[PDB]
Design a binder for these strands. Sequence first.
RNA 1: UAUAUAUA
Length: 167
Amino acid sequence: KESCKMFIGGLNWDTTEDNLREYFGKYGTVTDLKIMKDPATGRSRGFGFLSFEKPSSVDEVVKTQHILDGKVIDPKRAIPRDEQDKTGKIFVGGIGPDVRPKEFEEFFSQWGTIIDAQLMLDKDTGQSRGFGFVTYDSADAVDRVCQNKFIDFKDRKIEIKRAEPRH
RNA sequence: UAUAUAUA
């Protein structure tokens, strides 16, 4: 059920749920998949929720990076809406070479558990450097950094601002 | 310094 639900992101708009299930079919059988198509706007969300009848598939799903239709995705465990609401996403800048995405997650962890943190790098053409994306289990953690606009990370201070629309 | 992730 929902407990076995997985979150899929970084999916090619052309990507279809059928390919999704087929892609993750190797792992087993999917009980409920949600690529999150957008027949209205005409463009899919680009991410979906994948569920498996057997939770075992989920364990293996995270082990692999996952490359679908020439794109890269990061399948992660689904987060309950109530818990999801508590969490938030902030924007960070001042990220460069030697930053290491792993260090980025541990770096921000100092002021928050950090449910998830990434450099985006959808195409690995630049998002990986320059700025970063961090998610916090609690909104309160975000406030800590708000007070701390500049943090000593790579010994060059970074500027952090609450998440904003792509505009 | 920007999300084809958190589904209106």
